[PDB]
Every structure is written in C-alpha cells, then in structure tokens.
Design a protein around this ligand. Sequence first.
Ligand SMILES: [Fe+3]
Ligand SMILES: [Fe+3]
Ligand SMILES: [Fe+3]
Ligand SMILES: [Fe+3]
Ligand SMILES: [Hg+2]
Ligand SMILES: [Hg+2]
Ligand SMILES: [Hg+2]
Ligand SMILES: [Hg+2]
Ligand SMILES: [Hg+2]
Ligand SMILES: [Hg+2]
Ligand SMILES: [Hg+2]
Lengths: 340, 340
Amino acid sequence: AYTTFSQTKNDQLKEPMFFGQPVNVARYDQQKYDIFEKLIEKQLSFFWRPEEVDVSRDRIDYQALPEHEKHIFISNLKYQTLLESIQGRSPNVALLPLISIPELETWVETWAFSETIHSRSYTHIIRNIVNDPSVVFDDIVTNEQIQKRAEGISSYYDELIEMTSYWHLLGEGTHTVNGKTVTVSLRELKKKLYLCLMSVNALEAIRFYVSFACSFAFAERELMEGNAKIIRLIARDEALHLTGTQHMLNLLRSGADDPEMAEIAEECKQECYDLFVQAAQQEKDWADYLFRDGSMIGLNKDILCQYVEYITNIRMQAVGLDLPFNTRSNPIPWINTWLV
Amino acid sequence: AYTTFSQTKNDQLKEPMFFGQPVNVARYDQQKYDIFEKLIEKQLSFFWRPEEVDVSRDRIDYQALPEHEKHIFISNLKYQTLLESIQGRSPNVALLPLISIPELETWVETWAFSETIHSRSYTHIIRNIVNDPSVVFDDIVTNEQIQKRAEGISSYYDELIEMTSYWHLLGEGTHTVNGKTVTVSLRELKKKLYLCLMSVNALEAIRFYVSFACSFAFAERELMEGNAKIIRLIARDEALHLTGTQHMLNLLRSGADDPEMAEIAEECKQECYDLFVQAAQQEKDWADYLFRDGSMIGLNKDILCQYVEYITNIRMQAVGLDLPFNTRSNPIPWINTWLV
Ligand SMILES: [Fe+3]
Ligand SMILES: [Fe+3]
Ligand SMILES: [Fe+3]
Ligand SMILES: [Fe+3]
Ligand SMILES: [Hg+2]
Ligand SMILES: [Hg+2]
Ligand SMILES: [Hg+2]
Ligand SMILES: [Hg+2]
Ligand SMILES: [Hg+2]
Ligand SMILES: [Hg+2]
Ligand SMILES: [Hg+2]
C-alpha cells in the first residue's frame, strides 16, 4: 500500500510525523515542526570532507605506539566503523516508508547522508595507518567481541522493517498466509517504531560518546591529531543527530502529534528503560576487550565505566526516563575541550 | 529476509550488484566497479547551497512577463519540482533493499541526497517569486496535465517495491494469501528491477533535459537569471546521475554481472523500447500544452519536439536500443552554453 507519490492533495501541516499519508510534494517554505528544518540547515552548514584532513603524521604516531595501545585504538576504530555502516543505511530503509511530513523525511535523508561521510572518514584513517585495510574490515564481521556489544541493534531495525512490509501488503487485521494465521496491528507497529527510535537515541547519545573519549585520550598526549580533527567534526554532527531523536521521541510522548502514541509510550515504559540499561551494560563489557592487553595512564576500564554511567543518566533524563545510576561529576572533564 | 547487517563473512568483490547478500561493512578502499566511487567523489566536490544564490530580481522579471510566458515558466517549474520530490526518496526505498555491493549502496544514498538539495532549491525560487507558494505546491499534486506522467513513473517504482516485499517475506514459489494463490518468481522480480532502471534512466536522461531547455531559453533573454544559476548547478549534478544508471544497465545486460538478467533483458527488449518511446511521446504532448497560449523567443512545440527526438536517439543508443527517430544534429546548440 506504499506509494512513491500519493495523488491525494493533503494538508501536510495536519499529518502526524509517522503512519499518515505518504509524503508527495517536497516543500520547505513551511513546516509542522520547525526544528527539523533547523537541523537540516545546521547540518548543511557543517559540510566537510574527510579526504581533505591531514592525517599524514598519524602513521608515524601509530607506528610508535606500544602494542596494547595499538589494540585499544584499532578496536575502537572497528566498532565506530560497524556502527556507522549500520547508521548509513538503516534510517532510510526503516523510517522513510513510514514518514508523513516533508521536513522529517528530508531530515532523515540528510542525517543518513552525513553517516556515509563518517563511514568514509574511517576508511580515510584506516588507509593511512595500516598496511592493509582488508585485515581491519574483515575482522569486523568476525570476532564475536565486536558483535557482542552491538547485538540487538540490527535486530530492532530488521523487526521494524518486516512488520512494516506486512502492513503495507496486507493492511490491518488477521490474515491467512500459507495456512498460518498472521496478525497485523497498527498499535503494535507503532510500539515497534518507538522502541527502535529509543535504541537509535542510545546508539548516538551513548555508544558513540564513549568511543570519542578513547579517541581524545590519545589527543591529550599529543598523539593521533589527524584522527582527532576528524572525531571533533564527527562529534559536532552527532550532537545534531541526537537532538533530532530526542525531539522525535518527546514529541511522540506529548500526545500532541498522535494521542495513541502517548498511550503506547506509557506502556513501552519499562521496555525502553531496560534497553538503555542493556546498552550501558554492553559498553562496560566491551571495556574488558578494549583493555585486554593492558590500559593507558588516564584511561582504563574503571574510568570508562564511570563515564558510561555519567553520560547515560544525562541522556535518559533528556527523554523523561528515571536514572539507573548514582549521580556523579564528570570523571574525565578534559573531554569538554574537545567537544563543542 | 532483509537485514541491516548480514552476519555472514563474504567477498564484496564477488557479489552481484543486486539480489546478492545484503551489504554489511561500509568500506571505500576497494570496489568491484570503480565508476560508483568516482561518482561519489565527483558529486561531493560539487556540493552547493541554493540559499547562496541571489534571486532577488527574479520577482520583478516574472511579474513583467506576458501571461502566456508566465504559464510556460511556472508549468515547467512545477513539473521539475514534481520529479525532484520523487527522485529524492525513491532510489533509496526502491534500491537499498536489493543492493549487494558497498560502492553502489553509498552512491545511491549520495545520489538521493543531491536530489533533496534540488528540491530545496525549487522552494527557494518559488517563494522568491509568487507571494503565496501554497498555490504552486498544491497544483503540482492535482494538475491533470502534469500527472499524465507522475503515475507512470511512480508505477514502475511501486510495483518493484511491492514484489520485493513479497520476495523478502515469502520467498519464491506458489503461495496462498486469504483464499488467493500468489506466485513469487525471482526471474519476474529481476525483470521488474530492469524496468525501474530503464524508466529512471529515461527520466534523468530525457525528461529533465527537456525542462532545462525551457529554463535556459529565459536566461538567453537576460530574464529569471537567479533561476538560471540554480538550474545550471542542477544540470551539472544530473550528468552524474544519468552516468550512474547507464553503467548499471549496461553491466546488467552484457551478462558480465548476472547471466540471468542478461537473458531477461534480451527477452523483454521490445518492451524496453516501447517504454522509452512512450516517455518521449509524453514530453512531446507536454510541449503542446506548454505552448497552447502562444510561444516565446527561442522556443515552440516544433523546436522542442525536435530536441526531444535528438536527445532520445542519443540516450537509447547508449543503452543498446534501436533508434526510434530519424538522425539529425542538435536543433538548439545554444543550450550547450549552460550545460557541458
Ligand atoms: Fe555518525
Ligand atoms: Fe549519527
Ligand atoms: Fe535532480
Ligand atoms: Fe537526478
Ligand atoms: Hg529506528
Ligand atoms: Hg532501531
Ligand atoms: Hg573510552
Ligand atoms: Hg522506476
Ligand atoms: Hg520545456
Ligand atoms: Hg523545452
Ligand atoms: Hg526490458
């Protein structure tokens, strides 16, 4: 039931963010939610190209690095790479088919485009510090260590995409497919989207900020500056992305866009709380692999874990959830000079 | 049966362009087909922002235009806006789920992204020349003459998107759904893909160039110069887009990438020919509507129809189809001043 161009003339200012009539005309002179247009404008003003950044000295720095420090750096790089690979394609495949207002549709495509730039920035870095990228990229797919901290991400997406297909093909109701009953409920599909968005918010607001900490730690000891410039640029974009998800979630919760959503959100309550708790726990567990062969002066499992708790409470509070960790001060205040 | 991150370790250099294992890692250090990486790089170096273009004198230019010329300029602008709205979302929703090589996946997202900048530019022009933009945007969806093309284009995308869902959900074979038999054939799905591709090739290779001629006809008279600067940037991007689909089609029909597709394209060869000739005929009928109230300096239904046949012959030959019209030279060589 999906269409690339709905022939019905509708007031786009009256459609909900999701599940309404598919967007037909792309206009930007007006918007139901001005914030998405502001995010497109900001992101476009930040346009950058990784190839231009000078990472020529990073090879000398990396080579001089002690083995366990090479391990920490390259492992952080492999994870960032896997997350961006998924973020480059997923927002378009999972959200585009469900969006019903123009500014949000375009923001999703701009956001996803920026992710492919990040992925491209990692190839730029890898190529300039290793003799063969092929070894780095192949290890990403294998090595359960990586897949372990990331387990569940592709899960939330894949499930949303499949239920969305059944909905477009069969419509709401109970059906018979090859002799088996299949139920299609819009209420359950709306729940699937909210949970997905929450997982994405956790990915960009928490999982990525933990990785930045590891990157900037090297920058503090005046090493890997080429990588550092790029990470600052990526972090500047990520702040825009997390703002977008925070607004999507809070607007859906308010009930002003779709009352049924506010009702479902109250039911999603414990589930979204738990997925944030699970993500936080996965980041900590990943620390065990990062510091397998040893840690660094100002960075170790303990400090990283404190930062995970510190940032998770901040992110969860921003979307109205209760805080799972003890309140604390920033454990690595030096990172502030690198962000913003 | 689609996944945002396939857990199987595969050689991305040995996968077909389409219908293979879904892309897992996003890397840009190598590629099966260099053309797509080349295209991503060129498109990125061309980055521009419509806001930067001064269109402050276009308002007075438009008001002073005779009645029939306003009709021409605005009808053309609305058709362009229509196609751009479709091209900004469709390649993503229709192709991403079927691609199996990383360079092609990112090119498609980069391509789609560039189209949303084109949509943004038309909003920039429209509100700088009409006072009440809503009137323009609403006519785009309901205009009977314009829609005499919207459904045909949308139909090719929609049918491919629907069959793709059945294939991903049920797989090949004879199934039953709510008392009805439903057959799923990969061979038929392959044919559907070859068709959106031929259709989109005709769209960017022919439909858009016919509209460029009209825009630059005004620029040759020193009118609507802000509009002209923007169409020049747009046309520069389109040359890259059509290069992309031309390569996809030739790789699929030669048999180099997928023997089966080559066998399929050979059997539906007459259908592909009729499809291209049908697109040229619609552009001819349009020129008719465009000049129903009179012509202007440098353009008329006859000169325009001659350009359609000239450009159509060139594009069809590029993808292996016989020429439908008589060969001739370029009817309007002055257009090269604004193109390539
Ligand atoms: Fe990113
Ligand atoms: Fe992001
Ligand atoms: Fe375009
Ligand atoms: Fe295009
Ligand atoms: Hg999501
Ligand atoms: Hg998700
Ligand atoms: Hg860290
Ligand atoms: Hg198509
Ligand atoms: Hg025209
Ligand atoms: Hg024309
Ligand atoms: Hg064909």
